[PDB]
Design a protein around this ligand. Sequence first.
Ligand SMILES: Cc1ccc(O)cc1Nc1ccnc2cc(-c3csc(C=O)n3)ccc12
Length: 345
Amino acid sequence: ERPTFYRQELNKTIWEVPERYQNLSPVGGSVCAAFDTKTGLRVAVKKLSRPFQSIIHAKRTYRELRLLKHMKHENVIGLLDVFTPARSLEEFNDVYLVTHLMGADLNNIVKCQKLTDDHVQFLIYQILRGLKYIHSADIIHRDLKPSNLAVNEDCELKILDFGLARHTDDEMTGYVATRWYRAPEIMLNWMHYNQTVDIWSVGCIMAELLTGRTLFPGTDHIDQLKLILRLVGTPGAELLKKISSESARNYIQSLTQMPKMNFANVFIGANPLAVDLLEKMLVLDSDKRITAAQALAHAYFAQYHDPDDEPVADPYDQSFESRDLLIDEWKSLTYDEVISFVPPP
Ligand SMILES: Cc1ccc(O)cc1Nc1ccnc2cc(-c3csc(C=O)n3)ccc12
Protein backbone atom coordinates (compact mmCIF):
# COMPACT_ATOMS: atom_id res chain seq x y z
CA GLU A 1 0.00 0.00 0.00
CA ARG A 2 0.82 3.70 -0.04
CA PRO A 3 2.19 4.84 3.33
CA THR A 4 0.48 7.77 5.05
CA PHE A 5 2.51 10.96 4.49
CA TYR A 6 2.75 14.03 6.73
CA ARG A 7 3.85 17.58 5.86
CA GLN A 8 6.13 20.03 7.57
CA GLU A 9 8.00 23.18 6.67
CA LEU A 10 11.73 22.82 7.32
CA ASN A 11 13.16 26.30 6.80
CA LYS A 12 11.55 27.60 3.61
CA THR A 13 10.79 24.13 2.13
CA ILE A 14 7.84 21.77 2.50
CA TRP A 15 8.74 18.19 3.36
CA GLU A 16 6.11 15.56 2.80
CA VAL A 17 7.31 12.15 3.90
CA PRO A 18 5.99 8.74 5.05
CA GLU A 19 5.22 8.53 8.78
CA ARG A 20 8.02 5.98 9.30
CA TYR A 21 10.53 8.91 8.96
CA GLN A 22 10.54 10.86 12.19
CA ASN A 23 12.54 13.66 13.78
CA LEU A 24 13.60 15.27 10.49
CA SER A 25 16.45 17.69 11.08
CA PRO A 26 18.07 19.81 8.36
CA VAL A 27 21.80 19.06 7.96
CA GLY A 28 22.71 20.25 4.42
CA GLY A 29 18.61 19.32 -2.94
CA SER A 30 18.20 19.90 0.81
CA VAL A 31 19.11 17.04 3.17
CA CYS A 32 17.46 16.08 6.46
CA ALA A 33 18.65 13.62 9.09
CA ALA A 34 15.80 11.41 10.28
CA PHE A 35 15.00 8.29 12.23
CA ASP A 36 13.54 5.43 10.16
CA THR A 37 11.13 3.84 12.64
CA LYS A 38 10.70 0.81 10.34
CA THR A 39 14.37 -0.23 10.13
CA GLY A 40 15.68 1.47 13.25
CA LEU A 41 18.23 3.26 11.04
CA ARG A 42 19.45 6.87 11.19
CA VAL A 43 18.92 8.05 7.65
CA ALA A 44 19.64 11.00 5.38
CA VAL A 45 16.62 12.15 3.31
CA LYS A 46 17.50 14.28 0.27
CA LYS A 47 14.70 16.23 -1.34
CA LEU A 48 15.68 16.93 -4.94
CA SER A 49 15.48 20.60 -5.92
CA ARG A 50 13.46 21.49 -9.05
CA PRO A 51 13.99 17.98 -10.46
CA PHE A 52 12.17 18.42 -13.80
CA GLN A 53 12.79 22.14 -14.43
CA SER A 54 14.59 21.60 -17.76
CA ILE A 55 15.57 18.69 -20.03
CA ILE A 56 19.08 18.71 -18.57
CA HIS A 57 17.64 18.63 -15.00
CA ALA A 58 15.05 15.92 -15.72
CA LYS A 59 17.79 13.74 -17.30
CA ARG A 60 20.14 14.32 -14.34
CA THR A 61 17.37 13.31 -11.88
CA TYR A 62 16.86 10.13 -13.87
CA ARG A 63 20.64 9.51 -13.99
CA GLU A 64 21.11 9.92 -10.22
CA LEU A 65 18.18 7.68 -9.45
CA ARG A 66 19.36 5.03 -11.91
CA LEU A 67 22.87 5.06 -10.40
CA LEU A 68 21.72 4.94 -6.77
CA LYS A 69 19.22 2.15 -7.57
CA HIS A 70 22.02 0.04 -9.00
CA MET A 71 24.73 0.33 -6.29
CA LYS A 72 24.70 -2.63 -3.97
CA HIS A 73 28.10 -2.81 -2.40
CA GLU A 74 29.47 -2.33 1.13
CA ASN A 75 31.81 0.44 0.08
CA VAL A 76 29.42 2.43 -2.13
CA ILE A 77 26.40 4.54 -1.09
CA GLY A 78 23.18 2.52 -1.38
CA LEU A 79 19.59 3.57 -1.63
CA LEU A 80 17.43 2.58 1.36
CA ASP A 81 14.24 4.15 -0.07
CA VAL A 82 12.94 6.51 -2.75
CA PHE A 83 9.48 8.10 -2.59
CA THR A 84 7.13 10.80 -3.85
CA PRO A 85 3.92 12.11 -2.23
CA ALA A 86 2.34 12.11 -5.71
CA ARG A 87 -0.39 9.54 -6.24
CA SER A 88 -0.05 9.56 -10.03
CA LEU A 89 2.26 10.64 -12.83
CA GLU A 90 0.06 13.66 -13.50
CA GLU A 91 0.77 15.04 -10.01
CA PHE A 92 4.45 13.88 -9.71
CA ASN A 93 6.85 16.74 -8.97
CA ASP A 94 9.06 15.80 -6.07
CA VAL A 95 11.58 13.02 -5.55
CA TYR A 96 13.06 12.10 -2.16
CA LEU A 97 16.06 9.81 -1.77
CA VAL A 98 16.83 7.94 1.48
CA THR A 99 20.26 6.51 2.47
CA HIS A 100 22.13 5.55 5.66
CA LEU A 101 23.09 8.73 7.48
CA MET A 102 26.83 9.34 7.34
CA GLY A 103 28.56 11.04 10.28
CA ALA A 104 32.01 11.97 9.08
CA ASP A 105 33.86 12.21 5.79
CA LEU A 106 37.54 11.55 5.04
CA ASN A 107 38.30 15.30 5.45
CA ASN A 108 37.18 15.03 9.06
CA ILE A 109 39.59 12.13 9.51
CA VAL A 110 42.76 13.25 7.59
CA LYS A 111 42.40 16.61 9.24
CA CYS A 112 41.61 15.70 12.90
CA GLN A 113 43.67 12.55 13.71
CA LYS A 114 46.93 10.84 12.77
CA LEU A 115 46.60 7.92 10.38
CA THR A 116 48.85 4.93 10.86
CA ASP A 117 50.04 3.03 7.79
CA ASP A 118 47.51 0.36 8.74
CA HIS A 119 44.71 2.94 8.58
CA VAL A 120 45.87 4.04 5.15
CA GLN A 121 45.93 0.42 4.03
CA PHE A 122 42.35 -0.13 5.25
CA LEU A 123 40.94 3.13 3.86
CA ILE A 124 42.52 2.87 0.45
CA TYR A 125 41.70 -0.90 0.25
CA GLN A 126 38.01 -0.06 0.74
CA ILE A 127 38.10 2.75 -1.84
CA LEU A 128 39.65 0.36 -4.38
CA ARG A 129 37.15 -2.39 -3.48
CA GLY A 130 34.24 0.02 -4.15
CA LEU A 131 35.96 1.22 -7.35
CA LYS A 132 36.52 -2.30 -8.68
CA TYR A 133 32.73 -2.70 -8.27
CA ILE A 134 31.83 0.71 -9.80
CA HIS A 135 34.22 0.23 -12.73
CA SER A 136 32.99 -3.31 -13.47
CA ALA A 137 29.65 -1.72 -14.32
CA ASP A 138 31.39 0.86 -16.54
CA ILE A 139 30.56 3.66 -14.13
CA ILE A 140 33.17 6.38 -13.70
CA HIS A 141 32.87 8.35 -10.45
CA ARG A 142 34.80 11.36 -11.91
CA ASP A 143 34.80 13.32 -8.63
CA LEU A 144 36.54 11.25 -5.95
CA LYS A 145 37.86 13.48 -3.19
CA PRO A 146 37.94 13.19 0.62
CA SER A 147 34.63 15.04 1.06
CA ASN A 148 32.69 12.30 -0.81
CA LEU A 149 34.19 9.40 1.13
CA ALA A 150 32.13 8.74 4.26
CA VAL A 151 33.96 7.04 7.14
CA ASN A 152 32.36 5.69 10.38
CA GLU A 153 33.95 5.20 13.83
CA ASP A 154 35.27 1.77 12.76
CA CYS A 155 37.08 3.41 9.78
CA GLU A 156 34.53 1.73 7.44
CA LEU A 157 34.22 3.69 4.19
CA LYS A 158 31.57 4.35 1.53
CA ILE A 159 31.93 6.23 -1.79
CA LEU A 160 29.24 8.82 -2.12
CA ASP A 161 27.95 11.30 -4.68
CA PHE A 162 27.34 10.11 -8.21
CA GLY A 163 25.00 11.41 -10.91
CA LEU A 164 25.60 14.86 -9.45
CA ALA A 165 25.35 18.18 -11.41
CA ARG A 166 28.61 18.74 -13.35
CA HIS A 167 30.77 21.46 -11.73
CA THR A 168 30.65 24.98 -13.16
CA ASP A 169 33.79 26.64 -14.59
CA ASP A 170 33.75 28.96 -11.58
CA GLU A 171 33.66 26.06 -9.09
CA MET A 172 36.82 24.63 -10.64
CA THR A 173 38.66 27.99 -10.59
CA GLY A 174 41.54 28.94 -8.30
CA TYR A 175 42.86 27.43 -5.07
CA VAL A 176 40.02 24.88 -4.59
CA ALA A 177 39.76 21.27 -3.42
CA THR A 178 37.13 20.80 -6.18
CA ARG A 179 40.07 20.44 -8.63
CA TRP A 180 43.00 19.15 -6.58
CA TYR A 181 42.15 15.45 -7.07
CA ARG A 182 41.30 15.57 -10.79
CA ALA A 183 43.38 13.69 -13.39
CA PRO A 184 45.28 16.11 -15.69
CA GLU A 185 43.61 14.75 -18.82
CA ILE A 186 40.18 15.70 -17.54
CA MET A 187 41.34 18.91 -15.81
CA LEU A 188 42.75 20.18 -19.12
CA ASN A 189 40.43 18.29 -21.55
CA TRP A 190 43.42 16.57 -23.15
CA MET A 191 41.32 13.71 -24.55
CA HIS A 192 38.26 11.53 -24.08
CA TYR A 193 38.72 10.29 -20.49
CA ASN A 194 37.74 6.93 -19.02
CA GLN A 195 37.67 5.09 -15.62
CA THR A 196 41.44 5.53 -15.07
CA VAL A 197 40.70 9.11 -13.93
CA ASP A 198 39.36 7.66 -10.67
CA ILE A 199 42.70 5.92 -10.00
CA TRP A 200 44.51 9.26 -10.29
CA SER A 201 42.20 10.65 -7.63
CA VAL A 202 42.87 7.63 -5.31
CA GLY A 203 46.64 8.31 -5.64
CA CYS A 204 46.08 11.95 -4.66
CA ILE A 205 43.97 10.82 -1.75
CA MET A 206 46.34 8.11 -0.59
CA ALA A 207 49.36 10.52 -0.61
CA GLU A 208 47.34 13.03 1.48
CA LEU A 209 46.51 10.28 4.02
CA LEU A 210 50.20 9.48 4.23
CA THR A 211 51.56 13.01 4.48
CA GLY A 212 48.57 14.84 5.99
CA ARG A 213 48.91 17.40 3.10
CA THR A 214 47.23 17.90 -0.22
CA LEU A 215 49.40 16.41 -2.97
CA PHE A 216 48.66 18.93 -5.68
CA PRO A 217 47.18 22.08 -4.12
CA GLY A 218 47.36 24.18 -7.34
CA THR A 219 46.28 27.81 -7.25
CA ASP A 220 44.74 27.39 -10.70
CA HIS A 221 44.75 24.78 -13.49
CA ILE A 222 48.19 25.82 -14.80
CA ASP A 223 49.89 26.00 -11.43
CA GLN A 224 48.35 22.61 -10.69
CA LEU A 225 49.64 21.06 -13.94
CA LYS A 226 53.06 22.40 -12.99
CA LEU A 227 52.89 20.75 -9.50
CA ILE A 228 51.85 17.51 -11.17
CA LEU A 229 54.59 17.41 -13.85
CA ARG A 230 57.24 18.33 -11.26
CA LEU A 231 56.42 15.03 -9.47
CA VAL A 232 55.62 12.69 -12.37
CA GLY A 233 57.79 14.24 -15.15
CA THR A 234 56.73 16.04 -18.36
CA PRO A 235 55.09 13.80 -21.01
CA GLY A 236 56.97 11.77 -23.56
CA ALA A 237 56.24 11.61 -27.32
CA GLU A 238 54.00 8.63 -26.79
CA LEU A 239 51.66 10.42 -24.42
CA LEU A 240 51.77 13.65 -26.50
CA LYS A 241 50.32 11.75 -29.50
CA LYS A 242 47.35 10.70 -27.38
CA ILE A 243 46.59 14.32 -26.44
CA SER A 244 43.97 15.01 -29.15
CA SER A 245 43.71 18.71 -28.38
CA GLU A 246 46.22 20.51 -30.64
CA SER A 247 46.22 23.50 -28.27
CA ALA A 248 46.92 21.55 -25.11
CA ARG A 249 49.59 19.49 -26.89
CA ASN A 250 51.26 22.63 -28.05
CA TYR A 251 51.15 24.21 -24.57
CA ILE A 252 52.52 21.16 -22.85
CA GLN A 253 55.46 21.06 -25.31
CA SER A 254 56.39 24.64 -24.35
CA LEU A 255 57.38 23.43 -20.86
CA THR A 256 61.00 22.60 -19.88
CA GLN A 257 61.38 18.82 -19.77
CA MET A 258 61.55 17.35 -16.28
CA PRO A 259 62.16 13.76 -15.15
CA LYS A 260 59.90 11.81 -12.80
CA MET A 261 61.04 12.44 -9.17
CA ASN A 262 62.09 9.76 -6.74
CA PHE A 263 58.92 9.04 -4.74
CA ALA A 264 60.96 7.55 -1.85
CA ASN A 265 62.36 11.00 -1.42
CA VAL A 266 58.96 12.71 -1.74
CA PHE A 267 57.19 10.38 0.72
CA ILE A 268 59.94 10.19 3.34
CA GLY A 269 59.36 7.45 5.90
CA ALA A 270 56.45 5.85 4.01
CA ASN A 271 56.05 2.07 3.68
CA PRO A 272 58.06 1.27 0.49
CA LEU A 273 55.02 -0.73 -0.65
CA ALA A 274 52.84 2.38 -0.36
CA VAL A 275 55.49 4.23 -2.33
CA ASP A 276 55.39 1.53 -5.04
CA LEU A 277 51.63 1.65 -5.25
CA LEU A 278 51.65 5.47 -5.49
CA GLU A 279 54.12 5.18 -8.41
CA LYS A 280 51.72 2.84 -10.23
CA MET A 281 48.66 5.08 -9.61
CA LEU A 282 50.15 8.50 -10.41
CA VAL A 283 51.21 7.83 -13.99
CA LEU A 284 50.52 10.64 -16.42
CA ASP A 285 49.51 8.32 -19.26
CA SER A 286 46.18 7.02 -18.14
CA ASP A 287 46.66 3.91 -20.33
CA LYS A 288 49.50 2.79 -17.98
CA ARG A 289 47.94 3.41 -14.58
CA ILE A 290 47.17 0.39 -12.33
CA THR A 291 43.45 -0.57 -12.35
CA ALA A 292 41.33 -1.02 -9.25
CA ALA A 293 41.27 -4.82 -9.75
CA GLN A 294 45.03 -4.86 -10.18
CA ALA A 295 45.68 -2.64 -7.13
CA LEU A 296 43.63 -4.90 -4.80
CA ALA A 297 46.20 -7.63 -5.48
CA HIS A 298 49.14 -5.32 -4.75
CA ALA A 299 51.28 -6.42 -1.78
CA TYR A 300 50.47 -3.20 0.12
CA PHE A 301 47.02 -4.75 0.79
CA ALA A 302 48.17 -8.26 1.84
CA GLN A 303 46.39 -7.99 5.18
CA TYR A 304 43.01 -7.18 3.64
CA HIS A 305 42.91 -8.67 0.11
CA ASP A 306 40.40 -11.45 -0.21
CA PRO A 307 39.83 -12.30 -3.90
CA ASP A 308 36.67 -14.12 -2.87
CA ASP A 309 35.17 -11.01 -1.24
CA GLU A 310 35.78 -8.27 -3.79
CA PRO A 311 32.57 -8.48 -5.82
CA VAL A 312 31.73 -7.05 -9.22
CA ALA A 313 28.51 -5.32 -10.16
CA ASP A 314 25.51 -6.51 -12.16
CA PRO A 315 25.48 -5.09 -15.72
CA TYR A 316 24.38 -1.41 -15.87
CA ASP A 317 22.56 -0.27 -18.99
CA GLN A 318 23.31 3.41 -19.55
CA SER A 319 22.14 3.59 -23.15
CA PHE A 320 19.83 6.35 -21.85
CA GLU A 321 22.85 8.67 -21.83
CA SER A 322 22.83 8.84 -25.62
CA ARG A 323 19.07 9.21 -25.79
CA ASP A 324 17.37 12.54 -26.60
CA LEU A 325 14.03 12.83 -24.79
CA LEU A 326 11.56 15.59 -23.77
CA ILE A 327 11.19 16.69 -20.18
CA ASP A 328 7.96 14.74 -19.67
CA GLU A 329 9.54 11.58 -21.08
CA TRP A 330 12.51 11.84 -18.74
CA LYS A 331 10.06 12.61 -15.96
CA SER A 332 7.93 9.53 -16.83
CA LEU A 333 11.03 7.27 -16.84
CA THR A 334 11.97 8.57 -13.39
CA TYR A 335 8.46 7.94 -12.08
CA ASP A 336 8.64 4.31 -13.27
CA GLU A 337 11.90 3.98 -11.37
CA VAL A 338 10.38 5.48 -8.15
CA ILE A 339 7.36 3.18 -8.40
CA SER A 340 9.36 -0.03 -9.04
CA PHE A 341 11.86 0.49 -6.21
CA VAL A 342 12.30 -2.52 -3.89
CA PRO A 343 13.98 -1.91 -0.54
CA PRO A 344 16.97 -3.97 0.46
CA PRO A 345 16.38 -6.71 3.12
C1 LIG B 1 20.87 11.72 0.98
C2 LIG B 1 21.96 11.51 -0.04
C3 LIG B 1 21.66 10.80 -1.21
C4 LIG B 1 22.64 10.57 -2.18
C5 LIG B 1 23.94 11.08 -2.00
O1 LIG B 1 24.90 10.85 -2.96
C6 LIG B 1 24.25 11.81 -0.84
C7 LIG B 1 23.25 12.02 0.14
N1 LIG B 1 23.55 12.74 1.27
C8 LIG B 1 23.94 12.17 2.45
C9 LIG B 1 23.98 10.78 2.63
C10 LIG B 1 24.37 10.24 3.85
N2 LIG B 1 24.69 11.05 4.88
C11 LIG B 1 24.66 12.40 4.74
C12 LIG B 1 25.01 13.22 5.81
C13 LIG B 1 24.97 14.60 5.69
C14 LIG B 1 25.36 15.36 6.80
C15 LIG B 1 25.87 16.67 6.67
S1 LIG B 1 26.26 17.23 8.31
C16 LIG B 1 25.73 15.71 9.03
C17 LIG B 1 25.73 15.39 10.49
O2 LIG B 1 24.99 14.50 10.91
N3 LIG B 1 25.30 14.86 8.09
C18 LIG B 1 24.60 15.21 4.49
C19 LIG B 1 24.24 14.39 3.42
C20 LIG B 1 24.28 12.99 3.53
